[PDB]
Amino acid sequence: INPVNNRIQDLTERSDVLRGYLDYDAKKERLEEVNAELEQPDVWNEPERAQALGKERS
């Protein structure tokens, strides 16, 4: 049981560290603002901005 217990904890550390490297906080806000621009009804009035957020949001 304990080998797996440590397995989960190791993954905990790795996943939190990867959230650190990729800075999940700013991605969360940036994607949420991406979704803000996405909800913005004119989002597809400008195709360039729309597809920008398409690729960006993806």
Add this chain to the structure above:
RNA sequence: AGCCAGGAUGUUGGCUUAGAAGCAGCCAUCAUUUAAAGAAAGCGUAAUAGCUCACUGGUCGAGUCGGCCUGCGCGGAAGAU
């Protein structure tokens, strides 16, 4: 032929895609509601949407369709006294 109705459902078949809804493709392509309606033939939408069509009903009432052999013609076909 026109003309008038319908042109459905699961279901946007899924996946890759950013989106992909019949209609970018990949990719299956069935079953159901049936008069009949394609997991779509074209147009179209960023995507949907939307629009026709195939299919089918109803009014009209004699032809209509598109290949084969063959005769004669048409376009392709601009030059310098």
